[PDB]
Structure 1
Amino acid sequence: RNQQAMAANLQARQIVLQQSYPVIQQVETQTFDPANRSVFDVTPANVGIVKGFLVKVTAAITNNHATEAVALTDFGPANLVQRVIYYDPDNQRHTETSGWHLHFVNTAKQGAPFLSSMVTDSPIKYGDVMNVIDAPATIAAGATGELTMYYWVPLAYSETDLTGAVLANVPQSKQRLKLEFANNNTAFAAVGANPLEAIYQGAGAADCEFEEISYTVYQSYLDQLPVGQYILPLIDLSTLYNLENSAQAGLTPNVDFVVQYANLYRYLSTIAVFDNGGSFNAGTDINYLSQRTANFSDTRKLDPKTWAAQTRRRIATDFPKGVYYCDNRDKPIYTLQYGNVGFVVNPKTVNQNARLLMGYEYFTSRT
């Protein structure tokens, strides 16, 4: 009955991918000073099957301190967008997460730092030519820096898997893409302050100001949808593919800190950021990390370097200090199919105000 439903969906998906034509087009641009406004509600266009949004973000920042500079934080330009929230034409919320978490998922799905330029020995002048994602390492006292950042906000899982896409052929009922940008308070961290959400940190932080930020949203969708008597993958279009994040506190030295997957959700990936009191360490404050089921079954209890080794196989490098990734794409964590599962971190040292920022990528049935 469902075995048949599954097959029909996949076939409709296949026909839709074969007959419709992919389009990516600008839906809105705005230039502004976050000192004036930092939250914008973009109204996507209602056209065919929407797969996602590519959001271009640029900014000019000035360090007016008399003598001190500021330097990029570990997340840097990824913190230009503080949060993103999307609602479909039914006002059903899909993704709702931080710019840094969205960016880390973009990297994970690309298999390499998102839209980066790889360095090679080629004498031909390939390289960072176009500065697609870019930000100066430091901004000296009295200097102005230019930054460029891109985020892909997904609806559909991928280019070929339309699970999570949105049918937006629904006139009168619009979608909504909420972008909440960085501002002078969030973007600059004083020495000693927590740099988690900031773009720059340093002794010149107090006198740093955005001169402006601008964004351009491009909506990617499928046009010329195939018609029989309309071919649509009904499971695909009624599943939500979402990203979300949360914070957890309560870490104690040498004790297993467990974060339950309160599932029914099919978790494709998990990111755990160990914000150790504003301190971000390269695994030295952790004994091990693991994923486990009640049955004390640790399917992957690993020391930090070996955990990182698994990630190097996924994105060809390490995520920034204190950021840990876990891929469960092929076999998504689904609790009422494996029984309560949890993500575990056993800290070796815990600073005051220590916490785990959890980011999840998952599928779930709509309505």
Structure 2
Amino acid sequence: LRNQQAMAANLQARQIVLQQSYPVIQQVETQTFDPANRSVFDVTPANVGIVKGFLVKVTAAITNNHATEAVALTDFGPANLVQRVIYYDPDNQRHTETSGWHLHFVNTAKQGAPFLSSMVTDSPIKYGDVMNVIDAPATIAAGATGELTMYYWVPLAYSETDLTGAVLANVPQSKQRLKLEFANNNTAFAAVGANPLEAIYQGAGAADCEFEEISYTVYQSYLDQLPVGQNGYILPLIDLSTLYNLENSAQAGLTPNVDFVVQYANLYRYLSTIAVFDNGGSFNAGTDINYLSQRTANFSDTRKLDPKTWAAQTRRRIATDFPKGVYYCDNRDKPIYTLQYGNVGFVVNPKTVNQNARLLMGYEYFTSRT
């Protein structure tokens, strides 16, 4: 029995906390540097109240020192300003450990539209891209310097109203660790013909491109003035004892017309799946895939679909398509959850497979701390 009451209590406590505490977003750290010298930073957030997440602002100036050749944005562009992120809580338990581009795509999936974008409308009133919140020049010509701005939301809590995954740090004492690895002069620029997956710009002038400098500012979002009751602080024990993490992985071994299956692990409740078909450095709009699906061993496919129909389901979630070769799957209402390892798999049956082909997977999931 039980649980019904455990969950009922958790939810009641969550509601009291949301109703009684007050949300705060506060700058915790800012820094400007030259990636030629350093590109990995460990940010120390403040241990106060219940921490919900971190908004990371990144600005950069890129100079194309080439004599005559320009470079142009890759499909991910400024989303590759941060290569990776890792968060450790006060108890030394890791939550999210993923790439900047995967983190960005999840930010978009959760918003229901390209993250922090400005939607174009016919309004005569001058709304629009006034503030260049997420911005990067389409091209940087030989001899020019371009200015970029990127934002990432590193979540602990699942949402503003669902505190599952949030972290209690008003007491812990031990420090939190938000590790950020930024793009550098070796990852940001891809030569013509090279794989643009992790790069920001690609083109004939790439070898002579460099960062003038990069700056970041981390804002911490948390709940303060936590409600106190009889036994003390009123807290959603299930929420705070659950991890909400994003993680990535890479898989290879694809062959034309054969089902390539990536197994889901047990224990984790997978809310979403992203699969990027890095076809040997080529990123195609579904033309190199026969179909994608999610399958249960001995229960077949629950959604075996051609690429365009798969894309149609995604258009219902983010109001547009993710970039070429990027495929999304929403399982939020009924998370993939198997008691046995791989009782469910993500499937891609490729039509064309180039040399060095691989699927880069990204996952959003919930799992117990214990």
Structure-2-length-normalised TM-score: 0.98
- In 1, Cα distance between equivalents of 2:98 and 2:218: 17
* Deviation >3 Å, runs of 4+: none
Aligned length: 367
Aligned residues of 1:293 and 1:338 also touching (Cα < 8 A) = no
Cα deviations by residue, 1:142-188 (Å, 9 ceiling, x for unpaired): 00000000000000000000000000012530101000000000000
Cα deviations by residue, 1:306-345 (Å, 9 ceiling, x for unpaired): 0000000000000000000000000000012897000000
Cα deviations by residue, 1:89-134 (Å, 9 ceiling, x for unpaired): 0010000000000000000000000000000000100000000000
Aligned residues of 1:191 and 1:201 also touching (Cα < 8 A) = yes
- In 1, Cα distance between equivalents of 2:168 and 2:344: 33
Aligned residues of 1:335 and 1:341 also touching (Cα < 8 A) = yes
CA distance 1:339–1:358, shift in 2 (3 Å): closer
- In 1, Cα distance between equivalents of 2:366 and 2:221: 20
- What SS class does the counterpart of residue 132 from structure 2 fall into? coil
TM-align CA RMSD: 1.0
- My pick for the range that moved more, 175-184 or 330-339, is 330-339
- What SS class does the counterpart of residue 282 from structure 1 fall into? coil
- What SS class does the counterpart of residue 110 from structure 2 fall into? helix
Per-residue deviation, 1:297: 1.4
Per-residue deviation, 1:85: 0.2
Q: Which residue of 2 aligns with 1:219?
A: 220
The answer for unaligned runs of 5 or more in structure 2 is: none
- What SS class does the counterpart of residue 187 from structure 2 fall into? helix
CA distance 1:11–1:338, shift in 2 (3 Å): farther
Q: Which residue of 1 aligns with 2:126?
A: 125
- In 2, Cα distance between equivalents of 1:272 and 1:337: 22
- In 1, Cα distance between equivalents of 2:240 and 2:253: 39
- In 1, Cα distance between equivalents of 2:111 and 2:369: 26
- What SS class does the counterpart of residue 38 from structure 2 fall into? coil
Q: Which residue of 2 aligns with 1:194?
A: 195
Cα deviations by residue, 1:10-32 (Å, 9 ceiling, x for unpaired): 00000000000000000000000
Aligned residues of 1:70 and 1:138 also touching (Cα < 8 A) = yes
Where do 1:288-307 residues align within 5 Å?
A: 288-307=291-310
- What SS class does the counterpart of residue 186 from structure 1 fall into? coil
- In 2, Cα distance between equivalents of 1:131 and 1:272: 29
CA distance 1:339–1:255, shift in 2 (3 Å): closer
Q: Which residue of 2 aligns with 1:348?
A: 351
Aligned residues of 2:291 and 2:348 also touching (Cα < 8 A) = yes
Cα deviations by residue, 1:281-324 (Å, 9 ceiling, x for unpaired): 00000000000100151000000000000000000000000000
Aligned residues of 1:72 and 1:199 also touching (Cα < 8 A) = yes
Aligned residues of 2:266 and 2:340 also touching (Cα < 8 A) = no
Aligned residues of 1:287 and 1:303 also touching (Cα < 8 A) = yes
- In 2, Cα distance between equivalents of 1:239 and 1:171: 16
CA distance 1:183–1:339, shift in 2 (3 Å): closer
Per-residue deviation, 1:354: 0.2
Aligned residues of 1:89 and 1:170 also touching (Cα < 8 A) = no
- In 1, Cα distance between equivalents of 2:72 and 2:257: 33
- In 1, Cα distance between equivalents of 2:342 and 2:137: 47
Q: Does 1:4 align with 2:11?
A: no
Aligned residues of 2:31 and 2:215 also touching (Cα < 8 A) = yes
Aligned residues of 2:49 and 2:170 also touching (Cα < 8 A) = yes
- What SS class does the counterpart of residue 231 from structure 1 fall into? coil
Per-residue deviation, 1:262: 1.2
- In 1, Cα distance between equivalents of 2:314 and 2:356: 27
Aligned residues of 2:68 and 2:142 also touching (Cα < 8 A) = yes
Per-residue deviation, 1:241: 0.1
- What SS class does the counterpart of residue 185 from structure 1 fall into? coil
- In 2, Cα distance between equivalents of 1:182 and 1:296: 43
- In 2, Cα distance between equivalents of 1:209 and 1:170: 43
- What SS class does the counterpart of residue 237 from structure 2 fall into? coil
